[PDB]
Amino acid sequence: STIEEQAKTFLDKFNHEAEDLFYQSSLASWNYNTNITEENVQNMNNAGDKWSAFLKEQSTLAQMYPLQEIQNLTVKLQLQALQQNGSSVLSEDKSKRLNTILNTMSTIYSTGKVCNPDNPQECLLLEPGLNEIMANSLDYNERLWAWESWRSEVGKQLRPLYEEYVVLKNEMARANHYEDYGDYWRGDYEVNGVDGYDYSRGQLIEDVEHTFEEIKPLYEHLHAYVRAKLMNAYPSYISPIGCLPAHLLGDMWGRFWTNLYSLTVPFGQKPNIDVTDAMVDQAWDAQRIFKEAEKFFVSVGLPNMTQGFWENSMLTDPGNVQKAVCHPTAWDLGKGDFRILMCTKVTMDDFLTAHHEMGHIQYDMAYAAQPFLLRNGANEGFHEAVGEIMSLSAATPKHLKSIGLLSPDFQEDNETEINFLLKQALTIVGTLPFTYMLEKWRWMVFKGEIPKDQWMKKWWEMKREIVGVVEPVPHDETYCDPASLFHVSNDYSFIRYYTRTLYQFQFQEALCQAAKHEGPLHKCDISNSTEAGQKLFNMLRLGKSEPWTLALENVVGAKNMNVRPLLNYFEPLFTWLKDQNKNSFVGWSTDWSPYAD
Amino acid sequence: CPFGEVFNATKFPSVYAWERKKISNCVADYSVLYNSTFFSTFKCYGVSATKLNVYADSFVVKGDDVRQIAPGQTGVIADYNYKLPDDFMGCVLAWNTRNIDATSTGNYNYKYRYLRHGKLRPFERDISNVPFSPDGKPCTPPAPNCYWPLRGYGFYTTTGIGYQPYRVVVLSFE
Ligand SMILES: [Cl-]
Ligand SMILES: [Zn+2]
Numbered sequence: 028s029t030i031e032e033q034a035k036t037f038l039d040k041f042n043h044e045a046e047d048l049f050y051q052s053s054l055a056s057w058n059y060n061t062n063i064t065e066e067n068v069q070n071m072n073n074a075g076d077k078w079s080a081f082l083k084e085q086s087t088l089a090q091m092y093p094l095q096e097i098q099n100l101t102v103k104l105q106l107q108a109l110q111q112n113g114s115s116v117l118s119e120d121k122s123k124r125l126n127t128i129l130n131t132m133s134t135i136y137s138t139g140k141v142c143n144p145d146n147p148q149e150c151l152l153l154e155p156g157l158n159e160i161m162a163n164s165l166d167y168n169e170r171l172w173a174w175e176s177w178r179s180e181v182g183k184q185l186r187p188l189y190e191e192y193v194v195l196k197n198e199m200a201r202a203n204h205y206e207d208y209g210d211y212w213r214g215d216y217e218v219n220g221v222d223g224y225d226y227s228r229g230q231l232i233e234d235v236e237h238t239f240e241e242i243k244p245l246y247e248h249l250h251a252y253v254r255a256k257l258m259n260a261y262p263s264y265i266s267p268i269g270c271l272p273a274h275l276l277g278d279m280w281g282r283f284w285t286n287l288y289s290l291t292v293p294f295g296q297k298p299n300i301d302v303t304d305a306m307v308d309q310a311w312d313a314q315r316i317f318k319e320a321e322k323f324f325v326s327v328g329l330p331n332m333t334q335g336f337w338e339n340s341m342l343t344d345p346g347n348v349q350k351a352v353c354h355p356t357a358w359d360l361g362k363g364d365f366r367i368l369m370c371t372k373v374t375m376d377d378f379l380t381a382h383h384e385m386g387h388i389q390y391d392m393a394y395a396a397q398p399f400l401l402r403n404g405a406n407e408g409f410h411e412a413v414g415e416i417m418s419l420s421a422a423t424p425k426h427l428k429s430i431g432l433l434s435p436d437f438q439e440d441n442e443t444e445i446n447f448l449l450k451q452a453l454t455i456v457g458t459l460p461f462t463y464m465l466e467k468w469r470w471m472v473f474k475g476e477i478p479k480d481q482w483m484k485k486w487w488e489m490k491r492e493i494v495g496v497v498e499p500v501p502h503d504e505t506y507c508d509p510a511s512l513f514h515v516s517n518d519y520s521f522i523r524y525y526t527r528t529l530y531q532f533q534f535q536e537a538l539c540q541a542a543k544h545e546g547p548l549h550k551c552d553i554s555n556s557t558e559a560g561q562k563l564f565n566m567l568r569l570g571k572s573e574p575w576t577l578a579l580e581n582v583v584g585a586k587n588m589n590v591r592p593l594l595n596y597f598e599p600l601f602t603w604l605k606d607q608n609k610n611s612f613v614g615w616s617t618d619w620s621p622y623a624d
Numbered sequence: 625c626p627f628g629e630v631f632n633a634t635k636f637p638s639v640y641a642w643e644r645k646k647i648s649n650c651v652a653d654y655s656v657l658y659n660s661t662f663f664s665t666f667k668c669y670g671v672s673a674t675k676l677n678v679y680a681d682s683f684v685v686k687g688d689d690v691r692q693i694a695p696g697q698t699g700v701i702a703d704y705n706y707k708l709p710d711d712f713m714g715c716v717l718a719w720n721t722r723n724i725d726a727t728s729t730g731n732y733n734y735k736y737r738y739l740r741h742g743k744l745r746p747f748e749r750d751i752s753n754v755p756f757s758p759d760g761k762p763c764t765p766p767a768p769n770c771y772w773p774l775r776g777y778g779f780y781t782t783t784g785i786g787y788q789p790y791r792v793v794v795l796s797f798e
Contacts, residue, residue, distance in 0.1 A: 033758045033769055036739070040771050043738060047778050051730070054780070091768060339782050363687075363784020 031099060034092040038105050041085055042399045046361055049399070052078040053360035060368060061341055063350045086111055100220050101572075105400045116202045117195070125195040132188050132516045139184070141176035153177065153279070161279045162286045167261055171499050174274035178508045185516055186507035190479065193472055200473075209473030212520045215407055218574040224586060226576055232470070235525065238590045239463050245594055246460055248604040249452050250495050251613040253284065256291040268612045269619030270497040273490070277453075280512050281496060284457035288450050293603075297443045300424060302432040303375045309432075313342040313371040316378050319430065320385045323421065327553065327560030329389055336365050336388070344370035355380050357387030357414075359402070365391055375432075382421040386414040394570025405566070405575035407520065408527030413567070415531045416538065416553075423552040439550075441599075448549065448600035456597065459525060464493040466522045468509055480504055491617040499621050529590050533583045536592035538563060548595050625650035627657075630680050631717070631793050636725070638735040639705040640774065641751050642683040651676050657717065664720055664790070669695060669713035670797065679796035681706070684725060684734050686777060688786040690718050693794060704737040704773075706794075709746035714797040718790045725779050725789035732776035734789065739773040747796075 052074040059071040089109040097103045114122055141157065142150035151157045151173075160173040193208070200208040206228075213228040250271070257275060258265045264272065277286035284291075306316075321332050345351055353370035355377075360366065365388050371377050390413050394402050404410035420426060427433035468489055471477050477485045483502045486509050490496045502508060510516045539548060542556035553559045566581035576586045583589070594601065630645055637643050654674050657663065685693070685701060692702040695710045702708075708716075725731060739756040755763030756773045763770035779789040 028759055036758045036769075036771070039738070043775060050778070050780070050783075054782070088768065333784050335782060335784055360782075362780065363786040364780075364782055365784070 030092060030096045031102065034097065034106060035099075035102055037089065037092060038102060038398070038400075041089075041109070044081070044085075045399045048074075048077060048081055050360055050362045050364070053358070053364075057358065057360065057366070057368075060356075061345070061349070061351045063352070083115065085109060087115070101398075101401075103220070104571075105398065108400050112203060113199070117199055121195055121198070125192075125199070128188050128192050128195070129518055132185055132192070132510075135181055135184050135188075136511075136513065136516050139177075139181035141173075141180050144172070144176075158279055161274070162277065165260060165290075167264055167275075170274045174279065175500055177279065178502070178506055178511050182506045182508055182511050185510045186504065189507050189510050189516070197473060197475075207473040207475070209470040212522070213470075215520065216526075216575065218576060221574055221577065224574040224576045224580075226574070231522075234588055235463065235522070238529065238588060239459070241590050241594065242456070242459055245597060245601050245604075246456060247495075247613055248601065248608055249456055250615070251608045251611045252604050253287060253291055253453075253457075255607075255611045257287075260290045264621065266616075266619045268614075268616050270491050270495045270615045270617065272499050272621045273496050274499050276496070280461070281494070282458055282461055282512070284453040285450075287453055291449065291453065293445050293449055294442045297440070297446055300422075300427070300433075300443065300447065301375050302378075302427055303373070305432045306373050306375065306378065311373050313373075316371060316373070316381050317342055317367070317385070319378075320382045320417075320421075323382060323417070323554060324385065324389055326555050326557075327563070328557035329560055329564065330392065332385070332388070333363070333365055333392075335363075336367070339364065340366045341368050342371050355384050357384040357391065359388070359391035359395075361395075361399075361402075363395070379418040379421055382417040383414040386417040390414075390567055393564055393567035394572070396568070397570040397572050401571045403571045405569070405571060405573075405578040406526070407523040408530055409575070409578070411523070411527045412531035412534055413563075415527075416534050416563075419531075419535050420552045420554060423550055425550065426552040426554055429552075429554070444550075445600060445603055448597065452597060452600060455528060455593075459528060460494045462521060462525045462528075464489050465509065465512070465515070466520075466525070467493070469515070469521065483508060488617070491615075495615045497620055501620075501622060526588060529588050529593055530579070532593040532596055533579070533585075533589055534563075536595065537583045547599055548592070549597075549599070625652045627652060627680075630682060631657075631719075631791070633682070636682055636684045636721075636734075636791050638733075639683045639685050639689075639701060640735060640737040642681050642706055642749065645680045645682070647678045647680060662719055663717050665690060665716060665718035665792075667694065668715035669708075670715075679798065681794040681796070682792065684721070684777075684789055684791050685736070686786070687720075687784075687788050687790055690790050690792065693718075693792055699743075700738060701736065703743045704740045704750070705744070707744045707746045707748065708794070712746075712796070714795045716792065716794050718792045720785070720788055721791045722779075722781055722788040725791070726781045726783075727779070728781045731779045731789075734777045734779065735774050736777065737773050738775055739771060 055070040055074040059067045086109055089106055090112070092106060094103060094106055094110065097106070114125070117125070140150045140152045157173055157177060160169060164170045164173075196208045200211040203211070205211045205214065210228050213231045216226055216231050217228050218224060218226045254265060254271055255267070257271065258267065261275060273281055277284045325331055341351070344353065351370070355369040356367070358366040358368060367381075367384050367388060369377070369381065369384060371381065387410055390404060390410055391402075404413070424433055424437070424439070428435070428437070468477070468486055471485075472482070482504055483506050487498050487502070490498070514521050535551065536548060538553050538559040539551040541562050542553045542559035544551045562582055566578045569578050569581070580586055626647055653676065657666070683706065689701045692698060692700070693706060693708065693716050695708050695713060697708070725734065737750065740750065741760070744750065753772065753774050755765050755770050757763045757769055765772065777789070
């Protein structure tokens, strides 16, 4: 009958076919990540191919039912999703070529190794070795070399590929009725239909810029403080008013200043909110770690892990014989099958990691009652935010205490707290500007606002403007630095990294209020609090189902992305920096350069 | 009395093509099933006693689908495969058969019907594997808007309980 009703019958066939076929792709992909064989790595492609095809087939098959002739919101969403011409809306060659582009970039990146300018028998890869330098080296030159080698080898090689990349991908974007590839991505946060909850592809740019403003003071101050500390480690190389030399920021790009802790620690004479030693002493095994986390969730009103979770998961490294990939992952195979794959070691870190990944699983179950196409965090950054809330409560000394891993009568200390806070800023706050500038430049190279010859002239105008970072060596168009970063040269929207950050703070905030929290926002643990849970599980059981703006409302009572909870989390620190920066200079000169002479 | 043949039997049918065993004459005690935590449902809709005095239907369904073999009840299984009258009744027993009906490779023999014009009248059956179209029109799959109404479950040993194989036996009383 009606094209709507006959479209329902379509989805109702898809969900049934997807469930089955998706599970086969998962099971195979699983056998592989836990038993790296040839027979296993073989199936990992087959079922994974039936999948890609099946979707392509179901996509064009759905490209019939006219989105325009529907009034049921859900069925409209689901169809919209299934209707992705994406790669198949181009010429015969223009598509296959884009793939050659995408594919080689991924491989020149993962493969590219740089050789010693004097010892050509040893050559380092980005991981490890190269990233090992950027992370530990206190030698101005050794760091200077690695940073430049990489952006010089793979840097250049990617310039031509990317050149064409931005064209074909843009051609595709405008071909689907999007202002540019940048508009294609911002699309993810788009919502049409339910009013008072809509959100336009441009609204993101506005909301991200408007919010980034309120981060500046905090950042400028973290910046100023880190600078002065760096000046000490690298005497005479840094300017008391200049930007910071990109190669001295802790990792290859300066995405995170995490590794800078060593030389920026406020009170080096403090010590170890590291219970690794304690866990090891009380004979804790993987089991305990995971059972302990399960308890944490049950403590807030969430379900015990499924029988088949303890039954089918792999919480320990198989060791010899059976080889397996170890990146901690939370699997949702579907069919009610949930698993965690993790080569657990008895560290406070793996302990926190396990609370994080068991958060993803807990989200996966919450929305598993949704129809296949709706099982997934609201927007790209919801799932990460949730997993991060957990590690946030589990990290508190309060929690480590009540769990018997921290001495029963150990005290706070307003100094050991300023430390922890900084360790966090170095990572959480340092990334934001970087992440936000990266995507800005990327967005503009999509709205066409940057000429092929001002690609690095405009890159670094901004690293100096926004992030407050200067290049150690000047870079012309022989390079293409905003591409030596995995996410860039492997085609991934970077902005998620920014929103999820904000989100994850708006979440933790509500959930502490909700669970009636006393002290500063950062010392909060939400355990034993079924009350908070309820509120979390409110936006959890939705999945992609309601607009992401609604979903946020469910936990934070607001239709939008607010950054004040992120600053509240950093208030005891934020003010403390304003004191250190008493006689330091705060801000920078885009003009100063390391190389200049 | 001839209950052994029923639930102790080897092969069970799919839901859409269920079995109705006719048991009259002989006498059974009911202590056979009374005493046993083997079953995971054992709900009854009328009584729960004895008197040494009868229809037994059997089929297999997904875990989460067991809640539908009961009076009233939502749809899909209850709408297109097996329906209990809101009225009449006896008991409904089920047990997890993940060992038997599920293989680690995937078992798709057991099937169900997800598309049909209308709902089943209680105790009605439909073994009509005829290409479905949401308008009565005949079907020539792969023509668009044509789907086969009969699908296989796909019982893997590793699914969640909601997706594991359960054998059902509805005991009707007459
Ligand atoms: Cl860079
Ligand atoms: Zn994660």
